[PDB]
Amino acid sequence: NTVSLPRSCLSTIESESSMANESNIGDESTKKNCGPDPYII
Amino acid sequence: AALPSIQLPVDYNNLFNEITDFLVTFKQDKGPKYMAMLQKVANRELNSVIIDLDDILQYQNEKFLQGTQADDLVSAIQQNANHFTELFCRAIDNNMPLPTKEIDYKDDVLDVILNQRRLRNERMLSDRTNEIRSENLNDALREVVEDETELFPPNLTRRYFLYFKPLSQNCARRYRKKAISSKPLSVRQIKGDFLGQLITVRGIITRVSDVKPAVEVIAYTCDQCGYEVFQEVNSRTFTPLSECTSEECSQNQTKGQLFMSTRASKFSAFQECKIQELSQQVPVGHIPRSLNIHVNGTLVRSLSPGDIVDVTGIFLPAPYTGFKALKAGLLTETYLEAQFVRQHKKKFASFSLTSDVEERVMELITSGDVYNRLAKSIAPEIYGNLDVKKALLLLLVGGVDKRVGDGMKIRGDINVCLMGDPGVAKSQLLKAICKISPRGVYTTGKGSSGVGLTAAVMKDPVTDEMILEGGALVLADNGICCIDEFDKMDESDRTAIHEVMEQQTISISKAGINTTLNARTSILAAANPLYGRYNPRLSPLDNINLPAALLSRFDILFLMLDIPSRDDDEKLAEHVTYVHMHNKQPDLDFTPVEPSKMREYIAYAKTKRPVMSEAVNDYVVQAYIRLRQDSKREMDSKFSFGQATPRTLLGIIRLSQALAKLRLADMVDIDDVEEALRLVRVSKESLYQ
Amino acid sequence: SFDRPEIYSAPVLQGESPNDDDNTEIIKSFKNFILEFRLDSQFIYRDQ
Amino acid sequence: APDAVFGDRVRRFQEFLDTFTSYRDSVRSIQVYNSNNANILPHRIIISLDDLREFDRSFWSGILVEPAYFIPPAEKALTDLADSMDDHPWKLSFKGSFGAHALSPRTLTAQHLNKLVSVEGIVTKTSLVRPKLIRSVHYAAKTGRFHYRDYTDATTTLTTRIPTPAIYPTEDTEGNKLTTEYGYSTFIDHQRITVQEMPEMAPAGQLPRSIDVILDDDLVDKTKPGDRVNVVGVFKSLGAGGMNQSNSNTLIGFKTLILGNTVYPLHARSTGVAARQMLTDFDIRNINKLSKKKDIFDILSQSLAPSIYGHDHIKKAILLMLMGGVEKNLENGSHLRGDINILMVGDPSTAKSQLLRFVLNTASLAIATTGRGSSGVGLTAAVTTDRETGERRLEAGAMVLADRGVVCIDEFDKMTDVDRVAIHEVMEQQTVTIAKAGIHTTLNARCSVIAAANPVFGQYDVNRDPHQNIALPDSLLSRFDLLFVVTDDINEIRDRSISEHVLRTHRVTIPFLRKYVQYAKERVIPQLTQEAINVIVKNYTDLRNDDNTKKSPITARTLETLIRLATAHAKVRLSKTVNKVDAKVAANLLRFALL
Amino acid sequence: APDAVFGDRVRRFQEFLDTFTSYRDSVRSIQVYNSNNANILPHRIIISLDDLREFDRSFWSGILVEPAYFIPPAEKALTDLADSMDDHPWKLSFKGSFGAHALS
DNA sequence: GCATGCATGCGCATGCATGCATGCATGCTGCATGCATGCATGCGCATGCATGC
DNA sequence: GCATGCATGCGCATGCATGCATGCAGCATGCATGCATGCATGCGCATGCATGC
Numbered sequence A: 001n002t003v004s005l006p007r008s009c010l011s012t013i014e015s016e017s018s019m020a021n022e023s024n025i026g027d028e029s030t031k032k033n034c035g036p037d038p039y040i041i
Numbered sequence B: 001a002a003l004p005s006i007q008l009p010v011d012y013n014n015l016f017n018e019i020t021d022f023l024v025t026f027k028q029d030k031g032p033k034y035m036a037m038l039q040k041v042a043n044r045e046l047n048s049v050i051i052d053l054d055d056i057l058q059y060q061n062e063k064f065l066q067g068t069q070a071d072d073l074v075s076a077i078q079q080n081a082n083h084f085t086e087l088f089c090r091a092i093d094n095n096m097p098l099p100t101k102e103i104d105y106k107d108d109v110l111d112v113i114l115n116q117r118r119l120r121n122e123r124m125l126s127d128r129t130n131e132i133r134s135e136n137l138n139d140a141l142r143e144v145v146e147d148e149t150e151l152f153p154p155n156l157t158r159r160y161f162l163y164f165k166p167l168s169q170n171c172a173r174r175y176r177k178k179a180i181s182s183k184p185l186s187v188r189q190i191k192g193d194f195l196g197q198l199i200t201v202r203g204i205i206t207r208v209s210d211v212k213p214a215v216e217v218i219a220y221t222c223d224q225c226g227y228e229v230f231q232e233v234n235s236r237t238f239t240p241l242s243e244c245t246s247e248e249c250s251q252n253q254t255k256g257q258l259f260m261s262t263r264a265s266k267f268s269a270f271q272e273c274k275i276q277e278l279s280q281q282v283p284v285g286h287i288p289r290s291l292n293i294h295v296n297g298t299l300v301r302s303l304s305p306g307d308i309v310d311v312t313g314i315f316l317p318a319p320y321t322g323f324k325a326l327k328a329g330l331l332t333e334t335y336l337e338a339q340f341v342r343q344h345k346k347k348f349a350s351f352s353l354t355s356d357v358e359e360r361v362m363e364l365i366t367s368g369d370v371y372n373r374l375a376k377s378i379a380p381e382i383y384g385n386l387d388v389k390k391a392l393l394l395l396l397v398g399g400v401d402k403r404v405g406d407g408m409k410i411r412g413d414i415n416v417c418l419m420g421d422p423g424v425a426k427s428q429l430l431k432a433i434c435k436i437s438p439r440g441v442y443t444t445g446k447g448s449s450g451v452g453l454t455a456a457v458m459k460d461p462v463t464d465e466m467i468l469e470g471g472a473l474v475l476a477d478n479g480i481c482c483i484d485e486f487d488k489m490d491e492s493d494r495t496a497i498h499e500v501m502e503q504q505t506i507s508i509s510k511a512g513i514n515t516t517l518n519a520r521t522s523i524l525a526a527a528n529p530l531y532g533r534y535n536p537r538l539s540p541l542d543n544i545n546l547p548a549a550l551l552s553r554f555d556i557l558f559l560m561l562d563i564p565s566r567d568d569d570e571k572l573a574e575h576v577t578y579v580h581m582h583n584k585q586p587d588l589d590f591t592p593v594e595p596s597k598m599r600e601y602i603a604y605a606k607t608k609r610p611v612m613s614e615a616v617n618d619y620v621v622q623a624y625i626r627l628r629q630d631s632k633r634e635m636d637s638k639f640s641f642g643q644a645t646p647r648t649l650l651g652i653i654r655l656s657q658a659l660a661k662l663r664l665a666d667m668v669d670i671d672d673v674e675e676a677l678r679l680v681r682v683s684k685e686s687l688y689q
Numbered sequence C: 001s002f003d004r005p006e007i008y009s010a011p012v013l014q015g016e017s018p019n020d021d022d023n024t025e026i027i028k029s030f031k032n033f034i035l036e037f038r039l040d041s042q043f044i045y046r047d048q
Numbered sequence D: 001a002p003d004a005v006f007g008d009r010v011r012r013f014q015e016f017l018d019t020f021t022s023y024r025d026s027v028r029s030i031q032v033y034n035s036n037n038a039n040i041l042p043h044r045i046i047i048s049l050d051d052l053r054e055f056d057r058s059f060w061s062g063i064l065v066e067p068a069y070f071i072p073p074a075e076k077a078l079t080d081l082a083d084s085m086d087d088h089p090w091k092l093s094f095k096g097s098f099g100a101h102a103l104s105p106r107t108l109t110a111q112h113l114n115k116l117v118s119v120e121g122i123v124t125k126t127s128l129v130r131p132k133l134i135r136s137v138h139y140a141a142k143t144g145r146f147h148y149r150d151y152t153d154a155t156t157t158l159t160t161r162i163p164t165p166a167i168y169p170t171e172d173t174e175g176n177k178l179t180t181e182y183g184y185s186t187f188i189d190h191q192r193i194t195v196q197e198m199p200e201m202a203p204a205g206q207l208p209r210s211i212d213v214i215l216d217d218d219l220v221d222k223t224k225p226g227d228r229v230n231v232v233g234v235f236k237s238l239g240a241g242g243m244n245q246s247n248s249n250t251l252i253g254f255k256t257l258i259l260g261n262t263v264y265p266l267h268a269r270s271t272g273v274a275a276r277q278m279l280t281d282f283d284i285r286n287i288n289k290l291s292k293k294k295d296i297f298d299i300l301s302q303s304l305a306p307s308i309y310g311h312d313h314i315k316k317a318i319l320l321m322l323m324g325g326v327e328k329n330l331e332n333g334s335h336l337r338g339d340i341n342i343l344m345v346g347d348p349s350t351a352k353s354q355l356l357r358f359v360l361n362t363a364s365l366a367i368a369t370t371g372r373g374s375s376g377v378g379l380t381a382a383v384t385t386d387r388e389t390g391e392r393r394l395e396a397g398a399m400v401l402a403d404r405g406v407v408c409i410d411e412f413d414k415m416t417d418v419d420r421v422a423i424h425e426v427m428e429q430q431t432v433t434i435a436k437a438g439i440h441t442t443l444n445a446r447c448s449v450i451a452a453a454n455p456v457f458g459q460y461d462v463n464r465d466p467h468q469n470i471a472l473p474d475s476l477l478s479r480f481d482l483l484f485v486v487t488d489d490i491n492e493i494r495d496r497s498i499s500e501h502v503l504r505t506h507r508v509t510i511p512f513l514r515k516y517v518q519y520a521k522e523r524v525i526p527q528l529t530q531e532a533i534n535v536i537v538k539n540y541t542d543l544r545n546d547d548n549t550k551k552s553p554i555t556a557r558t559l560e561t562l563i564r565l566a567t568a569h570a571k572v573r574l575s576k577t578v579n580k581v582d583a584k585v586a587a588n589l590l591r592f593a594l595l
Numbered sequence E: 001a002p003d004a005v006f007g008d009r010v011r012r013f014q015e016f017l018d019t020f021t022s023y024r025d026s027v028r029s030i031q032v033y034n035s036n037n038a039n040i041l042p043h044r045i046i047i048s049l050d051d052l053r054e055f056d057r058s059f060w061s062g063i064l065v066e067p068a069y070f071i072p073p074a075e076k077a078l079t080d081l082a083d084s085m086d087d088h089p090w091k092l093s094f095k096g097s098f099g100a101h102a103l104s
Numbered sequence F: 001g002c003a004t005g006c007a008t009g010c011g012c013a014t015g016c017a018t019g020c021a022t023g024c025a026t027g028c029t030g031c032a033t034g035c036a037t038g039c040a041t042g043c044g045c046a047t048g049c050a051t052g053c
Numbered sequence G: 001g002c003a004t005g006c007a008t009g010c011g012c013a014t015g016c017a018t019g020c021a022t023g024c025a026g027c028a029t030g031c032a033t034g035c036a037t038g039c040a041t042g043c044g045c046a047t048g049c050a051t052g053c
C-alpha cells in the first residue's frame, strides 16, 4: 500500500514457540533447510 | 511405495506361444503359408512380411469349434498394436529356415554384412566353448558360454519388415464380430481415446515428402580394442558418442576414440504425408482439418498428392512443440504410423492380367457391343448426347504415342472441347468424367489462376530443402484436366493451356525459377457463346471469344445448341422427372456398367499398340485430300470455325488408333477410320439446321 | 512417451598389440596363475 | 485430512438436491441412456442460480463470490448421489440471473478475481485440440508386472495445492527396464480459445479488449471462430507476477484467465449461428391443427411483412424459398439442386429493401450483403491465412458461412463479372473450388439467394423490350428460379388505400411462423406423384412451345424449378406426397412471374 | 496409491488366519473383556512361526528375511478381521523356532 | 589390653563429552551478453479490369 | 472499337518475437576454531575396624 517473496523460510528467525524449536529439528543429525524460494501464493 | 504395481488380464507368454502355434500351423483354404514366406525371405527374394488378422481370426475359430481353449489375439493386437510387432519379430526369428541358395557376387551388400555377422557369432561361440572345455575346472556348459560372451543382437541380423493389415468387414460379419480396425474415420473423429490402437482413416492426400534415411542405430569402431559400438536413437535429435564403452576399454586406463561408420549403421526409409478430410465428412459451416502420417520401410512411395485412400496405422503420441507459455501439463502431438494402403481408384500402370480380372473382362467382351455399351454408361442420368459420350470415351482411352527418332515426339492424347447454349448439362459431363478418371482434376475459371495452375516455390517443413508444388495441370499428369468456364479465363492461363496442349510441358522463367515442367495430360474444356445463346445471324468465329488457332488446336470441337422442339422436349422432360421420382435411369433393356469395370477394361485396352497398314493409309490420304479441298470453300464464305489443316489428319489417325485399341486388336481396319470421320462430321450438325 | 535407448558392443577385429602394463593382461595373468600353479603336483588354489 | 466445513457444506448441498427433484431424475436419465445405448453421454448437469437463491442465500452468495470453497463440495455431493443411485466424477453448470456479475471483456477488472462470472463476446481464434497425459502404464520384462503413475498441474483444481512434479519412469525400483503401454495409458482433450467484445457493442474507433478461456474434456470443440458466445466460469490468477526470485522487471503482472465450465452459442443477425427453438406439445398440436385448413397457404403468406401493401405473390415466393424443396444424391455421385432463388427488378420506391430486411430478420440463418460492399475473397472464402504452427488455412466467406441458409443481396446490378462468374458455381453446383499456392480443396455452399435490382433507365419502361430494361447476362438469369417486375402506376383509388394503410401503421405472429417453418423443414420429405408428373410435363411443353414474349428464357432449369416449387408447396402442406394442387400452384406462380 | 503385491499378501494372510482359528477367538476374547470391564487390554496377539512354516513356506521365509514387506500386510489383515468381528490398529508378536536367526 | 595392617569415606586435581557461536573460503546460480532463426509487414512495381469516349 | 485510371497480385527489403548458450560476478553456507560447562575418574589422606602379640 519492489516487494518480493522472502528468499528464505521465516520459521527460524521467528521463534514462535518453545515447541516450535523442537519442530524445527528431527530425524537424527540432519539439519532443516527449506531451500531457496520455498513460498507459494 | 513409489511406483505401485497393478494387475491386468494380459499374459504375454501365453500370447507368444499362441503366436508360434499360429505361425507354424495356419492353413490357407502346400505347406504352411508363413513358413513358405519365411523360406522365400531366407533365400533373399522377399523384403516385407504382411500379417493378416483374418488368418488369426480363422485360426481362433478353428481352435474353438473343435473344443479346445484359445486366447483372443485379434483384440489384443488391436488395442495394443505397438507391442506385438516385436513379439512377432522374435517368434519369426526362431523359425526361419536355412538359406537354400548360396550367397554370390550378385547379392545386396546388406545381405553380405548380415551373413558375415552370423558367421562371426558362431565363431565366437565355438571359441568360448572350446576354451572353457580345455580348462578342466552339456546344458550348463552352453549356459555359461552364453553368459560370458557378447554377440550381435537379433535386430542387427534381421533383413525383413513386418506390417499388420486390419480385419475386413466381410470376415467379421461372417464370424459375428465387430472389426474396429477397419471402420473408416475422419480426422475429426480421431480423439485421444484412440491412442495406442490400430485404426483406419479415410481422406485425400495433399502433401508428400521425399524419401530420406532415418537412422535407427548408429555404429562406431575402436581401433584400440576392435569392438563395434551401437547407439540406439528414437528421438528427433541425438548426441554422438565420444569415448569407447566396451568391456576391454572400460576396464583399462587408456580408452580409444570412437569413429562413426555409416555402412554398419541401421537406417530406415522415411516419409511424412498430410491427409485432409473429404467434403462429405465436414460438418455444416466448418473448414476441413488435417492429420499426419508416417511411412517407413518398403511402404514408401505408395502415396502421391491428390489420392483418396484408406490408410491403416497405429495412432501414437509425440512430444509437445507449441509455444512454451501456452503449455498446461503434459500436452502431446499425434501422428499415424502407416501399415497398409488401399486406393479408391486403381492406376492403369499397375495393371496385371489374372484369373479374377480375366473372367470379368472376358464376360464383358462376350456380351458384345463393347463400344456403344461403354459409351452409354458415361453419366447415364443425362438424356441424349450419345456422340459426345463416344468422343468422351475415346478421350478416356486415347491413341498411340509414337517415337519417331532423332528426339522427335508426337502426342497420343486426345483433346475435346464442348461449347453450347446455357442449361445443356456441360458441367455434369465434366464432373462425371473427372470422377471416372483415376487421376482427374476439376477446375472452374478464376477460382484457379496463376500458381493455382503450374507450380510455386515453397520450403519443405520435414526436410530443409526447397521444392516445387504442382498446380492443377501437374496434379492431373497422365490424367484428364477438366476446365469449366473456359472462355472467362485470363491470358496467362490461356497461354499455359496452349503450351500444354502443344507439347505436354510448361516453361517458366521468373524470379527464382527457370525450369520446364511435365504436363502429360489431356484437356476437356467447356465454353459459352459470347452473347449467351448462339446467334445464327453472325459468323461462327464471331460467336466465341477464344482465338481461332486455339479452337483449331482441339481434335474434336462440339457445338450444342438448344432449338425448341415439342417432340424431343417431351422425352427429355420424361427422363428428368423420372430420374427425380426414383434414383435410377428409366431404361430396362439396358444395364449400365459400374465405374470399376470400365476402369479395368480401359486399363487392359491401354496395353495395345495397333499399327497402320497400306490400304488404310490410302483411304486416309484420299479422305484427307477430299476434306481439305471441301473445307476451303466453306471457310471462304465465312461459315467455318476453322479450315482443315494437318492437325485434322493427326486427330483422325489418333481416333482410329483409339477405336482399334478399344476393339482389342493389333491392327487397324477401315471401319475405324469410317467411325472417326463419322464423328468428326457429326461434330457440327448444330451449324447446318 | 518414449523409453530409454540402450548401448551395447561386440568384438570383431584385433586392435593394437597388447601391452604388458595394462589391466586386462594383469587379470589374465592372475587367472592363469590361479588355475595352473602347482605345488607337489597339486592344484592347491583351484582346489581350495 | 478431512475438514468439518467441507462436510457441512456437502451436507447442505445434499439437502438442496433433496428439496428439488429435477436434477435427480436428470442424473438418473443420463445413466439410463448410457446403460441402454451401450455413444456415451458426459456426466454433467445444470443448476439454476435462482432456485439456489430462494433456497439458501448464504450458499448462493458463497458460490457467487467464493466458488473455490463452495463448488467442490457441491460436485462431491452430486457425485455421491449419482454413485448411490445407480445399480468419472460429475461436474456442474450454472444458469439463471448473475446480477452484477454479468460483464463483458471491457468491464472485467481486478476486483472480480476469484469470483464466478458470465461474459459475452465474439470468438476470434481457437486452438488445436491436444491430448494431455494423466496416467501412464508400463511393463517390466524381467518380472512380468505392470506399474503406473499419475500427473497433475495447476489448472485441474480450484484451490491452490503444493506441487508434486513427478518424473516419467523409465526404470523399475530394482533397476530393470520398462516398456510403455500406450493403449492402457489415459489422455484427456484440451483446448484454449479467445473471446473479444462484440462488434455491435464495442465503442467505435477504439481498440477492443479480449480474454482467454480454458476448456477441458467434454467442452473441447463446442464453438468456432466468429461465433457469438456466452461463457460462464471462474476468473482466476496463476503463478507469481515476478515476485519469486529477484525478477527486477516490474512491468508484467499476474497471468489471468477463465477456467470455463459453461459455453453457450448465441444467435444474431448476419452471423453463422442458426436459430433453433424448443417445440412443446402445445405448439405441435396447434401446428398440426392449422395444417388441416384449406387457406393455410393464404394465411401464412399474408402473415409475412403485414406492414407492406400488396406484393402477395412475392410473399408467396418468399414463403416457398423459406420452406424449400428436396435435393437428390445418386449412388453414382451426382447431385441435383433443391434450393429456390428469387430476383426483384422494380421502381425505386417499391419497398424492396423492406422485404429484404424482413427476410434477414426472420430466417434462421441469413447473411446480408450489398452490391459493392463485398467482393473478391469476401464472398467465396478465397482468402488464406496461416497458424503460428506454420500451416496455411482458409476462413469462411459470406456464402461459405451461409451453407444451408439464405443470402440477401441488395443493389445486385452493381456487381462485376469477377464475382458473377464466382456466384454461377454457387447458384448451380453449390460448391466453391479454390486452387492457390499450397491449397486445393472444395467447400460446400448449399445456399439460396434473394436479390433486388434496379432498371437501367431509373424507372421501368413499357415501350421497350425487357432486355433493354434489365441488362443482365442471359446465363445469369437462367439460374434465378423466379424473376418479378414491380411498377408503381399512379391511381386515385390505389393511392388513397395505400395512404390509409400507411397512416394506420404510423399510429399469426412471427415466432409461430418460425416454429412452423422449422418443424416443416425438419420432419417432412415428400415424394413425386404421377399426377404432378403429367401436370408439370404439360406445362413445361406448353411454355417451351409458345410464342409469348417472356421476362426470362426457358430451359430444363424451368422444369426443375417447377418440380422444386411443387415439392416446397407440398412441404408447406405437411403432406408426404405431391398432389395435383401443388403442381398447379407452381405452374400458376411461374406463369404469373413470366407473364 | 494401492499396490497389487500388498493386496495379494493381505489376502494370503487372511487365508492363513482362516485355516487356523485360535487367533480369531483370542481377538474376540480381548474385545469381549474390554467391552465388559468398561482396565483396558492392548490390541495385540502372538503368532507361531511353526504353524506359518507348515502353512506357507514362502510367506514364512518372507517374514523371516523381509519383515519390512510382509509384516505390515499381516497387521492390516488382522486389523481388518478384528474390525469385521466387532459389533487402534492391531499389532503382532512372534514365537516358535527362529532357527539360525536366534543370536546374541 | 596394646600395637599394627587394611579397607572405607573425605578432599580434591584433571581430562572429556556435549553444545553454541564466529570469520572465512567455497561452490553454486542468476544474469547480462552474443546470437541464430523463422514470421510478419511496409511497400513498390507489373497485370488485368472498369470507365468513359 | 479505342485510351486512361484504378484495384490486384508478385517481389524485396526489414523489424521482431522466440529460444539456446556462455563468462562472470554476487550470495548463502559448510567448515575450522574458540570456548564454556557439567560429569566422571584416579589419586592420597584421615580413620574406624579386625588381627596378632
Ligand SMILES: Nc1ncnc2c1ncn2[C@@H]1O[C@H](COP(=O)(O)OP(=O)(O)O)[C@@H](O)[C@H]1O
Pocket: B381, B382, B383, B384, B421, B422, B423, B424, B425, B426, B427, B428, B572, B576, D336, D337, D428, D556, D557
Ligand atoms: N439433357 C439433360 N438431361 C438431364 N438433365 C439436364 C439436361 N440438360 C440440363 N439438365 C439439368 O439442367 C442443369 C444444367 O446445369 P449445368 O449442369 O451447369 O449445365 P450448363 O452449365 O450447360 O447449364 C443441370 O442441373 C441438369 O440436371
Ligand SMILES: Nc1ncnc2c1ncn2[C@@H]1O[C@H](COP(=O)(O)OP(=O)(O)O)[C@@H](O)[C@H]1O
Pocket: D307, D308, D309, D310, D347, D348, D349, D350, D351, D352, D353, D354, D355, D502
Ligand atoms: N407497398 C408498400 N407498402 C408500404 N410501404 C411502402 C410500400 N412501398 C414503399 N413503401 C415505403 O417507402 C419506403 C421505400 O423504401 P425502400 O424499401 O428503400 O424502397 P426501394 O428499395 O424500392 O427504394 C419504405 O420506407 C416504405 O415504408
Ligand SMILES: [Mg+2]
Pocket: B426, B427
Ligand atoms: Mg455449367
Ligand SMILES: [Mg+2]
Pocket: D352, D353, D354
Ligand atoms: Mg432498396
Ligand SMILES: [Zn+2]
Pocket: B222, B223, B224, B225, B226, B227, B244, B245, B246, B249, B255, B256
Ligand atoms: Zn575400445
